[PDB]
């Protein structure tokens, strides 16, 4: 066991022991980007795959090469904490080694001269933090990973009701990475088809006709042949015992001196053997067969020289005379049996009018590009150039891995270009499924779904920014003959920087993070959204796919799926999901080497998994290696069934492999329902960070890995002893290791406080460990917002009862006591940006007030002398944030202006207005203001004041760095020089004092490089001079209507809070905090709610006892033994850890932090039974019923039945009162029509819709319709002539025309139709 | 309508491209040709053209719809179209005679010329109805309604200038195609590919998409939307309040009911005028509250959910004074709308004037509507804590403290409330004073001793005269509470 | 399938018993959600005939 | 990529089709995908090359390309970032015929040559290049920098 845990330990419960490894959690992002931004010494995925493939580029026929090797990265411009605060994109420069090559006229492979290396700055590219976030414009924005239809050969069903005429379909889907789509198909006329890029239906013959196969060359390569023979002036056959199956005998077939099969009957297993055993190769055949059967090859008259039947043509007897008389030894026909080898292809080649390549080639482009006319060589180019190219078309790796998996082949790799032998087999195996045999493929199997993460998405985004410049490069390389520098000017920083920003800026992928919790933050990084670029749309989705399929197992979690229009489309990964070498999903399983469940684990892919026996989790194990249960429950072939012990190849290892992080933090899923579990995990993301956090006392076990791997809380990298703890910053001596070059270790941590997020909240990091204590490698030093001692708090601990209270809990509503609000528990700061821009002119720049004019009777004393609001101020009403003063006017320049320059004794002219102000209704307190003024024009007093304090800090920090680093080095030398004990002695002091003076430059040059950074970083965009934001914070309180819920799924709204006095009392006289309804619990279903509460009491009942030992000042040995045995026993479990050694200090502090709630850790899949609950209830002197008849604090009397009381661990949620509550009388209007505005911006509109109008009409009321739609909405002036009529009390209505409907008339008028009010 | 814009040809779209045609009917044309020039398949036509030699020549552009109607009429089809049919007899002879009667049955409403199909003048919307959507608050990036109408202007000049400067039909007819490309994107955006592909505007925004973006012009027009004195509100409970009441908040009530608030303060003499009151309003006052306690009883509140479908949505309630933000109400009426109070928005309507105020408190309230419009059963039927409590008291209880002590009537409820004797019991006889209106005429019938349980007997004195009493409490109220 | 579940929501249960319940719960959620559209059409449609 | 073809109002649209007119005369494939007519500013989709530039120089003269430089559209960083780089390079020594880089007023993001050097008045009449021409304006020793 480690340190910091020895303050608040949880009771480690569960059917399974504590020896297994947990991954780094946010590795899927990190371990992706690392590879994509790595100097990989092979053709590996990221940059060097995107570079070795793309650039060995030449000129158009000019023979001026550009050959590439390696790349040069640079130093970062600005750092994380500061530029997030600032509002600048996070990017680094790129130098590139560029050696040019030019070939000579008529000479093979040579070099004259390459000038130099030269190199270019290749624009700006963003990077990932150590936390695992991108930053754009000073706001954190992360891309979500994708799942789509993967590359490779796949088949589909689409049965019955697709036609809705009693017909089954069969279709192809050739999915490449890049380039066009190929859709091979089937029709009801037994034929093959093609729809390149979902276009129009055209034959698949045309493809064969196109790709090196004409009439004859098409038919030769399919399969096998019907060899007819004309020998001794009679028709004969070369018969094989394979082809006759599934047919009827038509004629008397006899050979080899024995009669076998006659007319009428069908063939059995008895008849086939007579062809195999007695040897049948050559047989005689009559004429009437050949009357209907179809010729295979072309034949020609050797005498007259004419067409003896074109390919795929039916026969006649008059021809048969001429054709047999001509001189043919070998005649060939087709098979085309309906059951086996169907008439697909044979029928197609007859339908389509043409034969040669010419027309087939000619047609495709006239269809590819309609409207435009063709050429001879535009045809020859764009087929070879479409599909037969390493540049335009790349099937790459994982495609060919799957493409070659499906077709049953030895080689998994082949040609980079599409080859002549591939599409043939692609064509064939589609018909092989259409004909009848085999089972239909499914995309539902996760074997047929590919993982791309944001780095593989960045990969997809890089090569376009490489190809778009290639055009410029190649077109410049051809025209450019002179060699006066090439890789400096011919490359620009514009197209590489811009093409990347198109996706990372404007996409559904790259969007605002929902940073309101460590959970929320982590889990946005670990999700999958299917709708996006190159995938799903609103057209195709509805049913299927959204639902779980068998192959998910422990890769993707069904629990964390956000609801809305796209329910079950956005899903989250499991805790223990990992990526393949191929780039897929995997689940770990313990190798069962015959009858031994190993500790060493091997992963297997979605296709590789199915064959071997994959267990379930819950099982028992023996001593030496053997299995306990005779008939263990397992899976393999997508279903659960019974199997033997030794045939098991693999075991399931862990409990929570299936479930996700946020879902594995809910206790007792296995007593709760699957129904209510889903809305918990979704709304568990959007929870408010409190000022004071309380923890969960019913824990799980996941909490310790999540907060550490989050990057939210301060994580200690190395191990030593804490120096100076402050609120601001914690400094720590290393002692153990010492740094590489010198000057000791020393770790420093800049704690973030009173900071802002994307969803309008507060983020405060707070200290944990004491003033001068020791620290290890990987221990929590400072807890962030809503976090506490290596535990994720989110919400708080609440006394919760389960009864009605004259229905103050009517309909899943909540009471709340005043002792909740009085303990100052759920307190939160909702923080809002109130920003202003003034300048951007072509005469005079808008001045920073220094005055503010002129309205009222008080405001001059409220605001500072400078212009901005003073550091901290309570804004109430409609005051000013930052500035006014604008240079309007242009009246004249008469005497009156020389007579206006002292009423307004300021500026050059009588001109001053406003910028922006505090909104009416919103009221809060200022904390810290930040200024960003353009470099070029001067700043205010405050813009200096902030940075001047920063410059003090800049020198103070470095001098404080100097203090111990000089002392630590020089005193270690001074002590040994005393311990040990002239020209050379002067020479030493010279060289020493030279090193002293050389050290003097190190700090000054670092300082200068750092002092440059501060003022220079005040230039965001062209044409925005003043960017000042007033940081006004609104602390919202525990008010009626605020969001409250349990972890299991009890959404509810506070009714009206009753006071403490009127709230009840227990036997000991301890009131209940929150009260819920018992009425939701059986309608929709929760037993976990019941269990968590009764265990919450159980946890805190033992907790209440342990305090008393310290409240009485008793202690010494006893306290240990009560806790020892509490951890020693909780109804027969493993992971049992007593307080074994625990000789002072540790115990003293363990108790100190573990008081008034001894926290349990109950698992998810190993949800505790009632024996564990009750034994802990027994350890803490509590009823087994969980039901005490309590005297009311109100009336005084006891209830008839015994009321269940618990602790629910209720939490708070985001959408509070103010967000939903709006009410506005009269004021402003929209720009189109004389109606009010949309919402959450200007006027309090709040729409009615078609639904409420139909309602309104039926309510039999003419006025209450008209008032909403004629009197007081559509007409502004109809309101204003009624503003006249209402106040006095005169009344009566007159509308006229309803204004909005003139837009009906007018838009039709502009359509080119006539509307005028005639008659 | 500011614009004129005279194109050297024309276009339209409704009349060029729509599933029931008009230009296709007035000429005898398909749409496919009126689509591509200016039924079989494409390759079938090309092969049919290849087979039927020459022929051909070539057609024309938009003028080959414009000039067509210069010898085309309405009141004159009726002596012609059936003379072709009259050649291969007969039937149609009468079809004209019927249509002649149809025309002679006018002439109040008539069918108008087919020249009006096609626009030598291309009309444009007025200034106010097309504004710039601001990006920051002063930079004014390209609107969702003018980029294409810049094109109408762009189209007329290009032709009027190259007819002056002389240009080939390769440069002239393609401009007529490009005259049709946006003038056919300007009034309709459907069935074809045109304009910008997802930069500022996601689709294209036509006058067709302004009238039919999704499902008509309800939103702007029919629906009106938004409205003065409107509010959105959340959830509570409300037990102390009545069913014929409305537990409003503090703050939102003052914001909405403004015009009468001042209308009082001005004319009576509380505030000096309309104006010394504003300064008093801006700062919030104690006196304001006292004045507005009076109007609340005189002016109701109409409240609904975010989805309403029945005549059980717009049920209205008399406001009553409350000092709490979240809106308290009845518990019965919640079953009528169908909400389990876990995040259900409750919108507000306005009860102004005198004439409109009649229809609130007289038609559709809680004070008024009780029994079902659809069913014969009650809608006012409880769920959860109501239902339960009643049985929880009205039950054949196991023993209890009591056995059986007999009681008169007024003494009952209390002895069982007082001490020892529980509330449930089972089995206590009572002088229940019942009344049954037999043979038509007020409260007839006399007292009786009948067997019930005791929570039952507690209730059976609240009893205002009518019902069976005790007969009905016996058994249960299972579905009988409603019944 | 041939076989069913055999245990109770109150009692301690198993890993692979919750898969099949989520297979159907996902259907039930889309059932409750997508029906608001169809009813919304059917509410209108009938009133838009009357 | 997107390059802003500056054209003249009235015949600004004429330029946008005069693109597509001359496109067919010099024809092959590619380059011009989707010609946007947004309106002095015509936004035109193009990858950089020598072709189509020669065409613009064959039929002018009202306006050319927009961005950073006329030869190769279209960058985004003008001269303020150049004014940050000049700080590391550093004079108040100004004379007739030396380049005197402006960075204050409406003459910011622009360079110029000093015309008149006043020592008595403490001004530099720096000629800023705007509209393919010159603009001579007095800007302080600080309101400018030596190139």
Contact (CB<8Å) B309/C39: yes
Chain D's closest residue to A493, CA to CA, is: D75
Distance CA B180, CA B151 (A): 11
Nearest neighbour of A935 by CB, restricted to D49, D74, D83 = D83
Distance CA B44, CA A373 (A): 18
Distance CA A769, CA A725 (A): 9
Neighbours of chain C (3+ CB pairs under 8 A): A, B
A650, β-bridge pairs? A591, A614
Distance CA A796, CA A786 (A): 10
Which residue in the block uniquely carries the two structure tokens 């004794």? A905
Contact in structure between A1295 and A1319 (CB atoms under 8 Å): no
B344 is in an annotated binding site: yes
Contact in structure between B253 and B323 (CB atoms under 8 Å): no
B164 is in an annotated binding site: no
The minimum CA-CA distance between B50 and chain A, rounded to whole Å, is 14
Distance CA A1227, CA A1243 (A): 7
The minimum CA-CA distance between B132 and chain D, rounded to whole Å, is 14
The minimum CA-CA distance between C49 and chain A, rounded to whole Å, is 12
CB atoms within 10 A of CB C11: 12
Taking the CA atoms of residue A961, residue A964, residue A966 and residue A968 in that order, the dihedral angle to the nearest 10 degrees is -140
Q: Which helix (H) or strand (E) holds A84?
A: helix A80-86
Candidates A72, A74, A60, A73; CA nearest to A99 is A72
- C-alpha distances (whole Å) from D69 to each of A537, A1059, A1124, D44, D74 are 41, 73, 78, 16, 7
- C-alpha distances (whole Å) from D65 to each of A1182, D68, D72, D75, D132 are 84, 9, 8, 12, 13
Contact in structure between B358 and B283 (CB atoms under 8 Å): no
Nearest neighbour of A1022 by CB, restricted to D1, D78, D83 = D78
Nearest neighbour of C25 by CB, restricted to A655, A674, A1169 = A674
Contact in structure between A423 and A122 (CB atoms under 8 Å): no
Taking the CA atoms of residue A382, residue A388, residue A389 and residue A390 in that order, the dihedral angle to the nearest 10 degrees is 160
Residues of C in contact with A558 (CB under 8 A): 19, 22, 26
Contact (CB<8Å) B207/A1300: no
Is the pair A, B in contact (3+ CB pairs within 8 Å)? yes
Candidates B139, B143, B147, B141; CA nearest to B131 is B143
Contact (CB<8Å) D13/B150: yes
Nearest neighbour of B221 by CB, restricted to A1056, A1258, A1301 = A1301
Q: Could you list the residue range(s) of the whole structural domain that residue D43 is in?
A: 1-90
Chain C's closest residue to A551, CA to CA, is: C19
- Token pair in block for residue A662: 């946020």
3-state secondary structure of B150: helix
Contact in structure between B250 and B319 (CB atoms under 8 Å): no
Is residue A253 exposed (0-12), middle (13-18) or buried (19+ Cβ within 10 Å)? Answer: buried
3-state secondary structure of D117: strand
Contact in structure between A13 and A1168 (CB atoms under 8 Å): yes
Count chain B–chain C contacts defined by CB atoms under 8 A. Answer: 3
Chain A's closest residue to C5, CA to CA, is: A640
Contact in structure between A405 and A313 (CB atoms under 8 Å): no
- Ordered by where they begin, the domains of chain A are 24-150+443-573 (no CATH), 151-223+342-442 (3.90.1110.10), 224-341 (no CATH), 574-654 (2.30.150.10), 655-711+787-826+1037-1220 (2.40.270.10), 712-786 (2.40.50.100), 827-937+1018-1036 (2.40.50.150), 938-1017 (6.10.140.1670), 1235-1319 (no CATH)
Nearest neighbour of D38 by CB, restricted to B147, B158, B197 = B147
Experiment type:
X-ray
Contact (CB<8Å) A1312/B331: no
- Token pair in block for residue B135: 């990006």
Rg of the Cα atoms in chain B: 39
Residues of A in contact with D43 (CB under 8 A): none
CB of D127 within 8 Å of a chain A CB? The answer is: no
Is the pair D, C in contact (3+ CB pairs within 8 Å)? no
- C-alpha distances (whole Å) from A454 to each of A34, A449, A461, A568, A710 are 11, 16, 10, 22, 18
B340 is in an annotated binding site: yes
3-state secondary structure of C27: helix
- Token pair in block for residue D143: 């309101």
A640-649 CB contacts, 8 Å cutoff, 24+ apart = A640/A616, A640/C3, A640/C16, A643/A613, A645/A595, A646/A594, A646/A595, A647/A613, A648/A592, A648/A613, A648/A615, A649/A591, A649/A592, A649/A612, A649/A613
CB atoms within 10 A of CB D135: 14
Contacts with B, A 854-893, CB within 8 Å: 877
Cβ-based neighbours of A1271, under 8 Å, separated by 6 or more: A1278, A1279, A1282, A1293, A1295
Q: Which helix (H) or strand (E) holds A748?
A: strand A747-750
Residues of C in contact with A673 (CB under 8 A): 9, 21
Discontinuities in chain B (C→N > 2.5 Å), after residue? 38
Residues of C in contact with A444 (CB under 8 A): none
- C-alpha distances (whole Å) from A448 to each of A51, A399, A441, A655, B126 are 28, 11, 10, 26, 55
Nearest neighbour of B151 by CB, restricted to D11, D14, D37 = D37
Contact in structure between B304 and A1252 (CB atoms under 8 Å): yes
Chain D's closest residue to B142, CA to CA, is: D38
The minimum CA-CA distance between A598 and chain C, rounded to whole Å, is 21
Distance CA A1095, CA A1103 (A): 12
Residues of A in contact with B217 (CB under 8 A): 1303-1304
Chain A's closest residue to C13, CA to CA, is: A670
Distance CA B357, CA A1263 (A): 9
What is the CATH classification number for the domain harbouring D42? 3.30.70.940
Contact in structure between A634 and A643 (CB atoms under 8 Å): yes
Distance CA A1161, CA D87 (A): 61
Distance CA A722, CA A742 (A): 20
Contact (CB<8Å) C13/A1251: no
3-state secondary structure of A136: strand
Q: Which helix (H) or strand (E) holds C47?
A: helix C17-47
The minimum CA-CA distance between C37 and chain A, rounded to whole Å, is 11
Chain A's closest residue to C16, CA to CA, is: A616
Using DSSP bridges, classify how beta strands A330-333 and A226-231 pair: parallel, antiparallel or unpaired: antiparallel
Q: How many helices (H) and strands (E) does chain B have?
A: 18, 8
- Token pair in block for residue A259: 């009669």
3-state secondary structure of B195: coil
Neighbours of chain A (3+ CB pairs under 8 A): B, C, D
Query: Is the peptide bond preceding residue B366 cis, with omega within 30 degrees of 0?
Result: no
Query: Could you write out the DSSP letters of every residue in B77-93?
Result: GGGTTTHHHHHS-SSHH
- Token pair in block for residue A553: 């197992």
3-state secondary structure of A1024: coil
- Where are the strands (E) in A248-353, listed by range? 253-255, 258-261, 282-284, 299-300, 307-308, 330-333
Chain B's closest residue to A1286, CA to CA, is: B353
CB atoms within 10 A of CB B353: 19
Nearest neighbour of A810 by CB, restricted to B130, B237, B260 = B237
Distance CA A1223, CA B258 (A): 12
- C-alpha distances (whole Å) from A131 to each of A108, A299, A522, A715 are 53, 75, 9, 10
D68-71 CB contacts, 8 Å cutoff, 24+ apart = D68/A494
Contact (CB<8Å) D106/A475: no
Candidates A447, A678, A462; CA nearest to A583 is A447
Distance CA B366, CA B371 (A): 11
Is residue B447 exposed (0-12), middle (13-18) or buried (19+ Cβ within 10 Å)? Answer: exposed
The minimum CA-CA distance between B284 and chain C, rounded to whole Å, is 44
Count chain A–chain D contacts defined by CB atoms under 8 A. Answer: 55
Contacts with A, D 8-37, CB within 8 Å: none
Which residue in the block uniquely carries the two structure tokens 């057209």? A539
- C-alpha distances (whole Å) from B378 to each of B335, B370, B481 are 11, 7, 10
Distance CA A194, CA A205 (A): 9
Q: How many helices (H) and strands (E) does chain A have?
A: 35, 60
- Token pair in block for residue A993: 């004092």
Distance CA A349, CA A347 (A): 6
Distance CA A364, CA A370 (A): 10
Candidates A1225, A1301, A1226, A1241; CA nearest to A1269 is A1301
Distance CA B230, CA B232 (A): 7
Length of chain B: 483
Distance CA B296, CA B320 (A): 6
Length of chain D: 147
């Amino acid at each position: 066991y480690s340190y910091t845990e020895k303050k608040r330990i949880r009771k480690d419960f569960g059917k399974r022991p504590q020896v297994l490894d947990v991954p780094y959690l946010l590795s899927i992002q990190l371990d992706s980007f690392q590879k994509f931004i790595e100097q990989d010494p092979e053709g590996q995925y990221g940059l060097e795959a995107a570079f070795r493939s793309v650039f060995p580029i030449q000129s158009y026929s000019g023979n001026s090469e550009l050959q590439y090797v390696s790349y040069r990265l640079g130093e970062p411009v600005f750092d994380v904490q500061e530029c997030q605060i600032r509002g600048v994109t996070y990017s680094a420069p790129l130098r590139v080694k560029l050696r040019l090559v030019i070939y000579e006229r008529e000479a093979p492979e040579g070099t004259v001269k390459d000038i130099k290396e030269q190199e270019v700055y290749m624009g700006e590219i963003p990077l990932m933090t150590d936390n695992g976030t991108f930053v754009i414009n000073g706001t954190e924005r992360v891309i979500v990973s994708q799942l789509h239809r993967s590359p490779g050969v796949f088949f589909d069903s689409d049965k019955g009701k697709t036609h809705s005429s009693g017909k089954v379909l069969y279709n192809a889907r050739i999915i490449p990475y890049r380039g066009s789509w190929l859709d091979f198909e089937f029709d009801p006329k037994d034929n093959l088809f093609v729809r390149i890029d979902r276009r129009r239906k055209l034959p698949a013959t045309i493809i064969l006709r196109a790709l090196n196969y004409t009439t004859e060359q098409i038919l030769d390569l399919f399969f096998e042949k019907v060899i007819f023979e004309i020998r001794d002036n009679k028709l004969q056959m070369e018969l094989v015992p394979e082809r006759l199956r599934g047919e009827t005998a038509s004629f008397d077939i006899e050979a080899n001196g024995k009669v076998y099969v006659e007319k009428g009957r069908r063939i059995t297993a008895r008849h086939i053997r007579q062809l195999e055993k007695d040897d049948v190769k050559l047989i005689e055949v009559p004429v009437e067969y050949i009357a209907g059967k179809v010729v295979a090859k072309d034949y020609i008259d050797e005498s007259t020289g004419e067409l003896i039947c074109a390919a795929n043509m039916e026969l006649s007897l008059d021809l048969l005379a001429k054709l047999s008389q001509s001189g043919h030894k070998r005649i060939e026909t087709l098979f085309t049996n309906d059951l086996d080898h169907g008439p697909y292809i044979s029928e197609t080649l007859r339908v389509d009018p043409t034969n040669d390549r010419l027309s087939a080639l000619v047609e495709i482009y006239r269809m590819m590009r309609p409207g435009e006319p063709p050429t001879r060589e535009a045809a020859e180019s764009l087929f070879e150039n479409l599909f037969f190219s390493e540049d335009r078309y790349d099937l790459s790796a994982v495609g060919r891995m799957k493409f070659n998996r499906s077709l049953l082949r030895e080689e998994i790799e082949g040609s980079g270009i599409l080859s002549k032998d591939d599409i043939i087999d692609v064509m064939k195996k589609l018909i092989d499924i259409r004909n009848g045999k085999g089972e239909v493929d499914d995309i539902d199997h996760l074997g047929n779904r590919r993982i791309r993460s944001v780095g593989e998405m960045a990969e997809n985004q890089f090569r376009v920014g490489l190809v778009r410049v290639e055009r410029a490069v190649k077109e410049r390389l051809s025209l450019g003959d002179l060699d006066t520098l090439m890789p400096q000017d011919m490359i620009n920083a514009k197209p590489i920087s811009a093409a990347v920003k198109e996706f990372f800026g404007s996409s559904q992928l790259s969007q605002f993070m929902d940073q309101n919790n460590p959970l929320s933050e982590i889990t946005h990084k670990r999700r999958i959204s299917a709708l996006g670029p190159g995938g799903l749309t609103r057209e195709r989705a509805g049913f299927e796919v959204r639902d779980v399929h068998p192959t998910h197992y422990g890769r993707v979690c069904p629990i964390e799926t956000p609801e809305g229009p796209n329910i079950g489309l956005i899903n989250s990964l499991s805790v223990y999901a990992q990526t393949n070498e191929y780039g897929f999903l995997e689940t770990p399983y313990r190798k069962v080497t015959d009858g031994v469940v190993t500790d060493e684990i091997h992963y297997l892919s979605a296709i590789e998994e199915g064959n071997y026996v994959i267990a379930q989790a819950n099982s028992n194990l023996d001593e030496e290696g053997h299995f306990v249960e005779d008939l263990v429950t397992c899976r393999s072939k997508g279903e659960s069934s019974l199997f033997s012990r030794d045939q098991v190849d693999y075991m399931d290892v862990s409990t929570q492999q299936v479930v996700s992080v946020g879902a594995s933090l809910i206790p007792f899923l296995e007593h709760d329902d699957a129904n209510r579990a889903l809305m918990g995990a979704n709304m568990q993301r959007q929870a408010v960070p409190t000022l004071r956090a309380d923890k969960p006392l019913v824990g799980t076990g996941m909490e310790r890995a999540v907060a550490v791997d989050s990057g939210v809380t301060a994580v200690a990298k190395r191990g030593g002893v804490v120096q100076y703890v402050d609120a601001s910053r914690i400094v720590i001596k290393v002692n153990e290791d010492e740094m590489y070059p010198g000057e000791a270790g020393i770790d420093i941590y800049n704690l973030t406080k009173y900071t802002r997020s994307n969803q309008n909240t507060c983020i405060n990091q707070m200290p944990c460990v004491s003033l001068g204590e020791p620290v290890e490698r990987g221990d929590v030093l400072a807890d962030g917002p809503s976090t506490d001692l290596g535990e994720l708090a989110l919400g708080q601990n609440m006394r919760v009862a389960f009864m009605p209270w004259n229905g103050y809990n009517f309909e899943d509503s909540i009471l709340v006591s005043e002792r909740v609000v009085q303990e100052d528990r759920f307190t939160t700061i909702h923080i809002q940006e109130l920003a202003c821009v003034s300048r951007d002119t072509k005469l005079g720049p808008e001045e920073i007030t220094a005055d503010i004019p002129n309205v009222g009777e008080a405001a001059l004393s409220k605001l500072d002398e400078s212009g901005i609001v003073y550091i901290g101020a309570e804004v109430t009403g409609g005051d000013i944030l930052v500035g006014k003063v604008t240079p309007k006017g242009e009246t004249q320049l008469t005497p009156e202006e020389k007579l206006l320059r002292a009423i307004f004794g300021e500026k050059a002219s009588d001109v001053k207005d406003s910028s922006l102000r505090v909104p009416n209704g919103v009221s809060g307190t200022v904390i810290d203001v930040q200024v960003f003024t353009r470099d070029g024009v001067e700043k205010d007093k405050r813009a200096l004041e902030i940075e001047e304090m920063q410059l003090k800090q800049a020198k103070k920090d470095l001098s404080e760095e100097l203090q111990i680093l000089e002392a630590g080095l020089f005193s270690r030398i001074r002590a040994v020089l005393v311990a040990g004990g002239d020209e050379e002695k002067q020479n030493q002091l010279e060289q020493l004092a030279e090193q002293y003076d050389e050290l003097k430059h190190e700090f000054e040059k670092k300082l200068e490089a750092k002092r440059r950074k501060i003022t220079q970083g005040d230039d965001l965009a062209p044409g925005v001079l003043k960017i000042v934001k007033v940081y006004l914070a609104v602390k919202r309180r525990i008010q009626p209507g605020d969001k409250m819920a349990g972890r299991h799924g009890n959404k509810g709204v506070i009714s009206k809070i009753n006071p403490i006095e009127d709230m009840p009392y227990d036997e000991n006289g301890t009131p209940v905090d929150i009260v819920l309804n018992p009425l939701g619990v059986p309608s929709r279903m929760n037993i976990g709610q019941i269990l968590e509460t009764h265990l919450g009491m159980a946890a805190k009942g033992i907790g209440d006892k342990i305090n008393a030992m310290l409240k009485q000042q008793q202690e010494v040995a006893k306290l240990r033994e009560f806790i020892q045995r509490a951890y020693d026993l909780g109804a027969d479990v493993r992971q049992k850890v007593d307080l074994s050694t625990f000789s002072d200090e540790e115990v003293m502090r363990l108790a100190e932090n573990l008081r008034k709630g001894m926290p349990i850790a109950t698992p998810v899949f190993d949800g505790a039974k009632e024996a564990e609950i009750k034994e802990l209830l027994k350890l803490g002197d509590l009823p087994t019923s969980g039901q005490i008849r309590l005297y009311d604090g109100r009336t005084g009397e006891q209830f008839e039945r015994p009321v269940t009381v618990g602790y629910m661990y209720m939490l708070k949620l985001n959408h509070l009162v103010d967000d939903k509550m709006h009410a506005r009388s009269t004021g402003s209007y929209s720009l189109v029509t004389q109606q009010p505005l949309g919402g959450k911006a200007q006027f309090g509109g709040q729409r009615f819709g078609e639904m409420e109008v139909w309602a309104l009409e039926a309510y039999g009321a003419a006025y209450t319709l008209q008032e909403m739609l004629t009197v007081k909405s559509d007409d502004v002036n109809g309101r204003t002539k009624m503003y006249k009529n209402i106040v006095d009390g005169n009344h009566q209505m007159e509308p006229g025309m309803p204004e909005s409907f003139n837009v009906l008339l007018k838009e039709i008028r502009s359509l080119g139709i006539n509307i005028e009010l005639e008659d | 309508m500011g614009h004129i814009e005279l194109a050297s040809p024309t276009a339209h779209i409704w009349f060029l491209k729509s599933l029931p045609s008009r230009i296709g009917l007035l000429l005898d044309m398909p749409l496919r040709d009126i689509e591509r020039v200016l039924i079989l398949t494409e390759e079938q036509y090309l092969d049919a053209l290849e087979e039927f030699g020459d022929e051909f020549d070539a057609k024309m552009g938009a003028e080959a719809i414009q000039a067509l109607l210069k010898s085309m009429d309405l009141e004159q089809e009726c002596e012609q179209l059936r003379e072709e049919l009259n050649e291969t007899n007969s039937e149609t002879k009468r079809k004209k005679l019927t249509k002649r009667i149809k025309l002679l049955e006018a002439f109040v409403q008539s069918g108008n010329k087919p020249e009006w199909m096609i626009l030598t003048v291309l009309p444009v919307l007025p200034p106010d109805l097309r504004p710039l959507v601001p990006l920051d608050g002063g930079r004014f990036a390209t609107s969702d309604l003018n980029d294409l109408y810049r094109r109408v202007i762009n189209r007329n000049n290009r032709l009027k200038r190259l007819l002056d400067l002389a240009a080939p039909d390769i440069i002239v007819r393609n401009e007529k195609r490009m005259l049709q490309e946006a003038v056919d994107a300007l009034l309709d955006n459907g069935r074809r590919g045109r304009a910008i592909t997802g930069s500022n505007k996601r689709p294209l925004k036509s006058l067709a998409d302004m009238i039919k973006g999704k499902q008509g012009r309800f939103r702007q027009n029919l629906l009106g939307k938004r409205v003065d004195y409107s509010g959105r509100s959340v959830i509570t409970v409300g037990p102390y309040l009545r069913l014929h009441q409305c537990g409003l908040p503090k703050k939102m009530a003052l914001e909405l009911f403004k015009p009468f608030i001042y209308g009082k303060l001005e004319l009576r003499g509380l505030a000096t005028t309309i104006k010394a009151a504003k300064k008093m309003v801006e700062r919030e006052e104690a006196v304001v509250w006292d004045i507005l306690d009076e109007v609340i009883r005189e002016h109701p509140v109409l409240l609904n959910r975010a989805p309403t479908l029945h005549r059980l949505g717009i049920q209205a309630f008399e406001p009553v004074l409350i000092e709490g933000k979240a809106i308290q109400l009845h518990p019965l009426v919640c079953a009528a709308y169908n909400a389990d109070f876990d995040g259900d928005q409750m919108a507000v309507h306005v009860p102004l004037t005198l004439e409109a105020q009649l229809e609130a408190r007289a038609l559709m309230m809680s004070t008024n509507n009780i029994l079902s419009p659809a069913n014969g059963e009650p809608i006012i039927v409880p769920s959860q804590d109501v239902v339960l409590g009643l049985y929880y008291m009205t039950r054949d209880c196991v023993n209890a403290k009591g056995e059986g002590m007999v009681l008169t009537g007024p003494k009952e409820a209390e002895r069982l409330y007082r001490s020892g004797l529980a509330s449930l019991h089972a089995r206590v006889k009572v002088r229940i004073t019942e009344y049954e209106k037999d043979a038509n005429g007020e409260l007839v019938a006399k007292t009786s001793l009948k067997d019930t349980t005791v929570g039952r007997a507690i209730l059976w004195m609240i009893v205002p005269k009518g019902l069976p009493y005790s007969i009905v409490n016996q058994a249960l109220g299972k579905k009988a509470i409603s019944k | 399938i041939e076989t069913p579940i055999t245990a109770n929501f109150r009692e301690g249960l198993n890993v692979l018993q919750y898969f099949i319940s989520t297979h159907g719960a996902r259907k039930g959620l889309a059932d409750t959600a997508l029906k608001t559209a169809n009813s919304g059409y059917l509410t209108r449609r009938l009133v838009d005939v009357a | 990529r997107w390059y802003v073809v500056q054209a003249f109002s009235g015949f600004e649209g004429r330029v946008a089709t005069s693109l597509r007119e001359h496109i067919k005369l010099h024809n092959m494939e590619d380059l011009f995908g989707e010609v946007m007519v947004p309106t002095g500013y015509v936004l035109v989709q193009m990858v950089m090359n020598d072709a189509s530039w020669h065409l613009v120089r064959s039929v002018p003269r009202v306006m050319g390309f927009i961005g950073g430089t006329s030869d190769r559209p279209a960058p985004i960083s003008d001269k303020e970032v150049d004014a940050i780089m000049n700080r590391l390079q550093q004079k108040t020594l100004f004379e007739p015929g030396e380049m005197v880089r402006v960075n204050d007023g409406p003459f910011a993001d622009f360079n110029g040559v000093v015309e008149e050097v006043d020592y008595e008045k403490s001004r530099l009449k720096v000629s800023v290049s705007i509209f393919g021409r010159a603009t001579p304006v007095e800007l302080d020793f600080s309101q400018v920098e030596k190139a």
